[model samples]
Target: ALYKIRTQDSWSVTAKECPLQAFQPNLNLIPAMIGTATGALIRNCVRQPVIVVDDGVYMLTYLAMRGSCQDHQKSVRHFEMGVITSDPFGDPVPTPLRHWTKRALPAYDGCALAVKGHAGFALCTETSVGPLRDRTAKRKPNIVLFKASLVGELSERVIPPQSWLSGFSFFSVYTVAGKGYAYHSKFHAFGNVVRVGQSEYQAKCRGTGCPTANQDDCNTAQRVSQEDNTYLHQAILSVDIDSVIDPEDVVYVIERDQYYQASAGDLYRVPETGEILYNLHNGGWSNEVQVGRIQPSDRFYMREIQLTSTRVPAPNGCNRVKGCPGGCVAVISPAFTPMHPEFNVGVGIFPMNQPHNPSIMHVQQQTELFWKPIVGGNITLHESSIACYSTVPPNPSYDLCIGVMTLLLHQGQLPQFQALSWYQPTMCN
Candidate 1:
């Protein structure tokens, strides 16, 4: 079971319970598996929960790992990009949305899902398939196009034949990493189709026609540098699918330069230096001008949030892994109300792991936030919210802290605030 916390002062304390469940046969594991373990064979382990819902269908994505242990650390050999779905409101249990155990899952993580018209989209941004061409690389994102039958049995969907790397075709970036202000993510997806790290110099390619298993047709792909095309690297990515085709689906590249990224210019100071800070995490400014206008405006908009200008000491009994975690936010874009056109409402997402900007699987508690082109975290919005269910404490596996998250928001009540207690759900096994 998961708790839906609604608070007036940013979940400072007492919450109005709005209970919900992500899966019916939810298996609660105790002491989540961390690194390596002796005498224990981990057959299934899931992490990094991403959730989305469309027209009553819910989609959940996670990194699925499996392997035995050697010398205490888990051996790495088997894996899969796992997805499952359920109406939760309709079906009591969820059904497998897609499976690839026979295909030998690629070392992929950070997968996000979106639904457009009758088509379903899954974008995988991380390809840690190490020797996929080593030295340095940005395995172009793997994309799957499919149709989902939310009302049928789980296996009814065919999430495309295979995934393809994207971003090069119709997308371009707005910032240059060498410029110092830009920090392309290696841990999270920054580019519309991929994620880049600040130090990954040399780059390689592996996709449809290319093969890393046999190194077929693979070559030195594009290098991520100051001189390279900016499209390959950006601060973060956002997905949107307004039209069935009049425009098709689109992923926007956001240049996260100012903290409290898109706040009122008068309040949030210029943090990413005084120059080159003109970039917005918006699609209107995208050079793909010919296509950017396909949709009207966003259903809901948001940004990443930061509270303290400097690191604050963790209070006593702070339960997060590492040091006590700081409070930050996955900022929801500004929602202008009909009565107040001068201002929009603010919404913040405080996931179980709270992966912040500067993304440190990333923090704290706060009511008001400052969003300059941001840092410390990422928050995204479609209809409304994504409530996360977590596992064990951060010490064992911080990545696994978040097990599942899902929610849906109606367009009428766009401006608002939602909360979840920092307390995590203990393992169930």
Candidate 2:
């Protein structure tokens, strides 16, 4: 029988253990015998491990667990894993609460962390071991903490729903390509809306609308016709100097290429300079009022952009569409990057089969094959005694490598595990 073990948002399972049944001589193929595999899979499937009775957020943790191949990497060295000073959403960068522990498994791997639904499970060849080491028996699955945007992001990424991609094809991007600073992404949503300053030169170009699937090889003989009234309103908005939108606030949409056109590819970057450009498409700015919040730079920072609306799920056109995999649709609004002229980002729209940003699937496969063989690795929190994650050997197998990563999950205590809930809390102000 399969057993589902919960640890907050993650879960895993193990077959029934039998003592009097005389353990099978060769239980290698049998999942019930391997304790580590069982615990690992179960732990990966369950949600967060700890809950703070005081606050509703899952406690930030120094250590985390990942399923063997869940995060595409088998072993994330302790040094390789640490909480960043900033969360994904443009919030105030938090101070790192680094600490060290001999144990790292619970924190480094996503598989080791809490999982959502059944998609988190990936069966490895079962081992013929005995009982698991630290399986939780009496722990009750319950709410641990809350995350504002991460939950939604995680679902769109990890879970596969037939309903979500109905009538759409799926084009999987394994790696990201293009260079320069700015925020980068791999996936591209088809049917992105594009706008431009329509001059005689701009509208006269035959290349416009050539990206439509049926337009391939067709001569550019069509005259440009304006469709939406909002386009005209935006044209009026663009001319206003004192208008809420800043002069430097770049606006563009995310596009998917139907045919092999280099310039029209999904990745957006400043030409000649290799700087990434924010395709200020999809979502609008939250506090777009020019209050001197933005400054020019070559790098990106948090809070330069804000989400004024929710991401509308576009219909899947992968099958009849020119570009994109068979099952995904474009969703999610543009997150803002801090002001910087040099802060251009790239998007890996196509399969990253080349060296620059190998496909995500390729990267995951490579990581899984190469990482699992390691004997030991550390998982630590950067506290008063530690440093950064990049400088040291994160997979050092033992000891808390603080200088490499000196941040803490909590300034005071670590987050305990929960069975049902998916999010955790942070202690930093």
Candidate 3:
């Protein structure tokens, strides 16, 4: 008689209603296909194991039984397997809590199934042989319990699947190819707005006061309040000063001579030159009446100025003349020495790849593969008889050539047999 052993189909153990982050995030119970094979299943297999069937076939069969968690948030930590008596077609009844023992299954990190491309059964005689007892009168065909605990934490961020592609948006770069790289990620939001300084000055140009306290002229009420009129009225108050000078309010005038020459006694003099010589000013300064301010203004006047000093020959152009009166001219060219004219030009010459910056995929793949244990050689099977398979009368036929058929059928039978299909030689012939 073909005794059909029906075990409990499936079961689940949910996290009891617990506080947020209080109950450890976990998958308490995950079920595998529950049923039975031949009574000689344990015996015929354990006695004569074959390397081909063990590594290539039997191992894969067991791995097929190795299903994983369905909970999207939590991950499997370890599995608990035990035996219990429960009717297959009954109402949902909780399995009694017992001292369930853990089986040495492959390590599963927070979410991924580690059993993919792996082999071996949970009840094999080599690795996992305990808890599986011989059927006695008292102990009959019953349920095989497979429970799993969870590890890792849950988050509030409900990132949509498409949003996950934002991770793909990032690319990795490195100077050294093939070397390991890591990408760390973090969620960031915009920072708070801060006021750097006082707001720009707003002058009151009209009303009872003839002038706004700052000593600027107020326009007559006769002027129309149109945009051009207001602008023209303010122009009268705008002082068109040369670039604001810093040395105790000095003003350098650019005459037809084109040289920036300042008044002798009013401006600070160069002590080394012994003359009333003044150096060129490249930046602007500020005063109460000046247009400059600590804070920026959208309506303020702007004048373009060179960011660096120009290299010009002495006043008489004698510096570059060989053996001329002027001292040896300091040749100023970009090649002579490195200088940051705008502070951003020289950056292009240096390599842009930084050790700290790795690609998103690199970091993600590293993190995902972190817990994966090194896969050694396939589990070996000793006895050869356990590896054999027989053919029945209605032989499965093939239309392809012998080589093609063997290749197709050999790879075919590997995943087809749910349990170990080790021996049965007469079915094909």
Q: Which structure among the candidates has the greatest lDDT?
A: 1
Q: Count the backbone clashes (under 3 Å) in each candidate.
A: 40, 90, 11
lDDT of each: 0.24, 0.17, 0.15
Which scores greater on TM-score, model 1 or model 2? 1
- As for model 1, its CA RMSD to the true structure in angstroms is 17.8
Ranking by lDDT: 1, 2, 3
Candidate 1 residue-wise lDDT, 216-324, digit = tens: 1111122233344432333333222232333223344322221112111101111122211111221111111010001113321223232211222222243442111
Q: How many backbone clashes does candidate 1 have?
A: 40
At residue 94, give the lDDT of candidate 3: 17
Per-residue lDDT value at 343 in model 1? 14
Cα-based RMSD of the predictions, in order? 17.8, 22.8, 37.8
Model 2, residue 305: distance off in Å is: 26
Better of 1 and 3 by TM-score: 1
For each candidate, what TM-score against the reference? 0.35, 0.20, 0.12
Model 1 alpha-carbon drift over 4 Å, by segment? 1-45, 54-56, 68-102, 105-108, 115-120, 125-135, 138-142, 151-232, 235-251, 256-365, 368-385, 388-429
The order by descending TM-score is 1, 2, 3
Report the C-alpha lDDT of model 2 over 136-178, residue by residue, as the tens digit.
Answer: 1211111111111212221111221111221222221111111
